[PDB]
Amino acid sequence: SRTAELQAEIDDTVGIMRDNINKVAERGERLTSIEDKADNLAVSAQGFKRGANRVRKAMW
Amino acid sequence: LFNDMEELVIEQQENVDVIDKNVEDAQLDVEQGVGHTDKAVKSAR
Amino acid sequence: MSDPVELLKRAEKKGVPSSGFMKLFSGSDSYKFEEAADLCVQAATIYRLRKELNLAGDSFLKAADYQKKAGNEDEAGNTYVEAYKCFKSGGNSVNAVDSLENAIQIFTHRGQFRRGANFKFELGEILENDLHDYAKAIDCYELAGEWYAQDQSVALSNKCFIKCADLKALDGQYIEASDIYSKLIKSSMGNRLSQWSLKDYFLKKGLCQLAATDAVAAARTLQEGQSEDPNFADSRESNFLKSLIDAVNEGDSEQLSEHCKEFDNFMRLDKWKITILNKIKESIQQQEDDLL
Amino acid sequence: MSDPVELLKRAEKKGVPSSGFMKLFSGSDSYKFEEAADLCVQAATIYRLRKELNLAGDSFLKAADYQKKAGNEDEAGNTYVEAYKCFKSGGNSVNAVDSLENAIQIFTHRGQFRRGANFKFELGEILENDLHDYAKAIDCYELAGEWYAQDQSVALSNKCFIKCADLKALDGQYIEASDIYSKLIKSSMGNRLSQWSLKDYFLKKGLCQLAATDAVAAARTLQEGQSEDPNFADSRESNFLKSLIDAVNEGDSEQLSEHCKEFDNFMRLDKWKITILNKIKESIQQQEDDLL
Amino acid sequence: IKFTKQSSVASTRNTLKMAQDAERAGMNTLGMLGHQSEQLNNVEGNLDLMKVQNKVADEKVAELKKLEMELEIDRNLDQIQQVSNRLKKMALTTGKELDSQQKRLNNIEESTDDLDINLHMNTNRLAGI
């Protein structure tokens, strides 16, 4: 009866952790998208800095 | 399946490094930009 | 909504460079190409909303060409990536290949080795799965792995080099595949996180060395792995590779097939291992046929 | 493409500050260094494209120095990170270390203790693996973990403390390493994610205190582990630590050797614990030398 | 009967080994996820500060424009059960932590996109001044 209980527990962990695999796949997709958008964010921040600097020089 | 999960996390380390670095640079660049617009507003007045 | 055909016609009209006497009075043509690109982008967006994806890709290609003519190469690379997305979702793998080649060229020229490696990898995927151009896919994966290795991306480098080694071994290039596996092994030593790949790695290396009929190479690889990685020493993979080497040295193809079945029962042989193992069996059988 | 040597020469001619009379008529030198830095960065990207990483890193260092002279400290830090990238990818650990030191000083000077700590950890790793500078790598890990505690990042501080105590214990400094293990125990106590880490910590602390001939100290460390951490109470680590304490209490080196063997039998032992336990046995042998 | 017992002993040995190795895999995964959680906490803090700075930028730009064998089987099963309990806890754990980080990464995505749009808007406005 012990070995059967161990088998059942292992099966349940297998199920939980297959769901974990699916979740980490979703997480990897999300992280790739966030990397792309943060590259966009950094480029935009640099552009905003440079434009603000150019306006600062313009009014000076 | 542990192994595949763990490998996917391997790959995701660099995603996390790049997000931290890029968002840091973006925050710093915007801080400089907001400083520049503050000085521009000061000069225009 | 505007008609995308009219947007493209206006883009074409504006994209004509200043020729002759008018060039003395016209400013930089950069500006004109910028609006030709903007009009093409608008047409591309309207096509994308209509799910006319291949046309959207074509419009993005035109926009990227005009952006290149304007000197805005970074925008051109981004628009090539957009044309790529449209083509890939549209099932037009050839134009998708072309878009990534252009985009990767722009990115590498701008020192963005990271982005170029990402897209070189995706391009290799399209070549492996959709177009079945395995050789230039091998080239793609090798170069992407090199770019990742320069960036100290051990992991993405390793993913590319796994794929490169697998495709090389499937293409009969067993020695070079074994060498890439040697590099991958050397990169995965001492990293707690990768040891599972490491066992797999040793096995594959030996298998290629058995497909090249160099059983001595398989033996030294297996001894090496047994000594440098205790987890591999006691593993099923090490024992299986011992057993395959023993079968190969004996010239007993049946014993090899028995060992393959035994290993299969406990650890499913994926398609790649089946292919290489079948090659090894065939080399054995050919040797008996010559000895007979 | 332009010749990078010509770009560097132009930057070097342009790196000369105004001196004397023309300083009274020449504007701020910041623009001039900006031009030199742009030229050096361009040359260095070119060098990077030809895989000449060391020259690219040197040009990055030159550009970072010029940008420091220009007052753009943050861009200088980014260029130092680039110099680090090309030096470490180039196999030159010393110049990569120099870039890391400059970058860390820059980041700490700007209030970015986070970047300082991350790059201090990278610096300590490089020292431990390539240059075998153990003491200075120990300091790097300690400082990184301290700044991480200042940044409220529990995990980074915990990891840095683990390697810090590891290096300190292996280098003969048992008491301080055990103290850092006490810090690790306290910081990791009550967290379900770091449970396993704790299970190890108690053992490591006891081992370090036992290498310091303080048997009562390993005894209290074990008793603390048993009473405070329920999982460690039933853990094989607790039993191994009590048996080590018992063997050294008896001064029976044979019994100690046996317990090392059973501990290896179910859980393969790591070089850190082997070195510490060898030191404990050799302390039994030094005790033996005293015994005459 | 003896051979079958030997086979059982060997199989329990393998089970205990590779179970322990699975324990390791999950453990380092969890430490790694905590590390990346801390990094994402930093990302979130920077995004919040950036939102505030973009509010300031909005107002400034607006004004700017205005201006023996049985026993071994038993013991190996004992050890396997202990490890398996620890494995189950780890699996439930990783599911939970991935869920929380998934919601966090989502919010990070929209926040980054919004900041990007706002910065592009302000840069376009500054271009005309």
Numbering used by the authors:
A (entry chain J): 27 to 86
B (entry chain K): 213 to 257
C (entry chain H), D (entry chain G): 1 to 292
E (entry chain L): 433 to 499, 589 to 650
Text taken from the publication that reported this structure:
SNARE (soluble N-ethylmaleimide-sensitive factor (NSF) attachment protein receptor) proteins drive membrane fusion at different cell compartments as their core domains zipper into a parallel four-helix bundle. After fusion, these bundles are disassembled by the AAA+ (ATPase associated with diverse cellular activities) protein Sec18/NSF and its adaptor Sec17/α-SNAP to make them available for subsequent rounds of membrane fusion. The disassembly requires multiple ATP hydrolysis events in the presence of Mg2+; as few as six ATP hydrolysis events are sufficient. The side-loading and side-release mechanism explains how Sec18/NSF can disassemble SNAREs with constrained topologies.
We present cryo-electron microscopy (cryo-EM) structures of a yeast SNARE complex, Sec18 and Sec17 in a nonhydrolyzing condition, which show SNARE Sso1 threaded through the D1 and D2 ATPase rings of Sec18, with its folded, N-terminal Habc domain interacting with the D2 ring. We chose the Sso1–Sec9–Snc1/Snc2 complex (referred to as the ySNARE complex) because each component of this complex crosslinked with high confidence to the D2 domain of Sec18 (Snc1 is highly homologous to Snc2). We prepared the y20S complex in a nonhydrolyzing condition and, after single-particle cryo-EM data collection and processing, we obtained 381,591 high-quality particles that yielded eight three-dimensional (3D) classes into which models were built. In the structures of all eight classes, Sso1 is threaded through the D1 pore of Sec18. Remarkably, our cryo-EM structures revealed that Sso1 is loaded into both the D1 and the D2 pores because the Habc domain of Sso1 interacts with the outside of the D2 ring, with class 1 having the most well-defined, discrete density. In class 1, the density for Sso1 within Sec18 is continuous from the D1 pore entrance to the D2 pore exit, where the Habc domain begins. The three-helix bundle of the Habc domain is then positioned outside the D2 pore, where it packs between two small D2 subdomains (protomers A and B) in an interaction driven by charge complementarity. Indeed, the electrostatic potential surface of the Habc domain forms a roughly opposite that of the bottom of the D2 surface against which it packs. Given that this charge distribution is replicated between each pair of D2 subdomains around the D2 surface, it is unsurprising that the Habc domain adopts multiple corresponding rotational states over the eight classes, presumably because of the flexible linker that follows it. This structural observation is consistent with XL-MS data showing a crosslink between the Habc and the D2 domain of Sec18. The nucleotide states and the arrangements of D1 around the substrate were also the same among all eight classes, with the ADP-engaged E protomer forming the top of a spiral staircase of tyrosine residues.
